[PDB]
UniProtKB/TrEMBL annotation, chain B:
SUPFAM superfamilies given in the database record: Bet v1-like
Protein name, as recorded: Activator of Hsp90 ATPase homologue 1/2-like C-terminal domain-containing protein
Domain Activator of Hsp90 ATPase homologue 1/2-like C-terminal: 17-151
CDD domains: SRPBCC_CalC_Aha1-like_3 (cd08896)
Organism: Nitrosomonas europaea (strain ATCC 19718 / CIP 103999 / KCTC 2705 / NBRC 14298)
């Protein structure tokens, strides 16, 4: 871990690892927690494989839409998910940024969730902090746990 | 996958060498330092961690003695079949510091040797044009050096 370029977040969710994994990889679920309200997701496309596209359209409270395009780098079922915005579909360099590493670990009561956002420079890391990374990402995880608990039965 | 003629450059060549040797040439630092760059250019140092997320590091040097460090990251490693690396990311999939490209190399054994197919993916047409021009003022030359080097292996 590089304190100069990376930001980390660790949380404990009272949900099984299999369910958490589905929440992180299924568009139908992603669009319900991936962004912190009042923000929302207008579209989400997922090709879950290395080199596969991770596309999402975020809408802010002002009504502005922001199409996001990323690429999956590692997909280790119920263990590790890595995607980057530095590359798009088929590993193509993105048009001129972060790489997210999500690690899961089952526990006696649920799943240990660890998220790390990797940046290219200290300035970008600092910028993400001033962008509300800790609060924002923290809120999304809370929304995730809330979603899985109520959709658990189904 | 089909290349994008506007952003991608392709190189196809037949090497009269067995696939196992071509693979060694593409992955062993000792060999890479003897063909990867067109002379008078040279490589004074090379590091390869051959795995997805592994660093691909090289130090380009001129007859003057000036060094030029270059860092990349491997994305896919399929033994003697396909190799993918990118300069848009560095070690451990970290976004690179702001010619960015992603290289896709595929090998196919033939009766006489190995079919070498490599593609350089760019982010924009402008970058593609700049790479192709500068390259011509090389990609093909390095391959010739590779074949000659591998012929000395025995």
């Amino acid at each position: 871990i590089d304190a100069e370029l990376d930001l980390m977040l660790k949380r404990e969710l009272a949900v099984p690892v299999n369910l958490v994994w589905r929440g992180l990889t299924e568009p139908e679920l992603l669009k319900k927690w991936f962004v912190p309200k009042p923000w929302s997701i207008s579209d989400c496309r997922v090709d879950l494989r290395p080199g596969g596209e991770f596309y999402t359209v975020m809408q802010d409270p002002e009504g502005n839409k922001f199409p996001n395009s990323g690429c999956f780098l590692e997909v280790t079922d119920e263990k590790r998910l890595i995607w980057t915005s530095a590359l798009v579909k088929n590993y193509r360099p993105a048009v001129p940024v972060m790489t997210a590493v999500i690690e899961l670990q089952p526990t006696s009561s649920g799943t240990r969730y660890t998220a790390c956002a990797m940046h290219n420079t200290p300035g970008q890391r600092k910028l993400h902090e001033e962008m509300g990374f800790h609060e924002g990402w923290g809120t999304t995880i809370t929304q995730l746990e809330e979603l899985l608990k109520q959709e658990k039965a189904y």
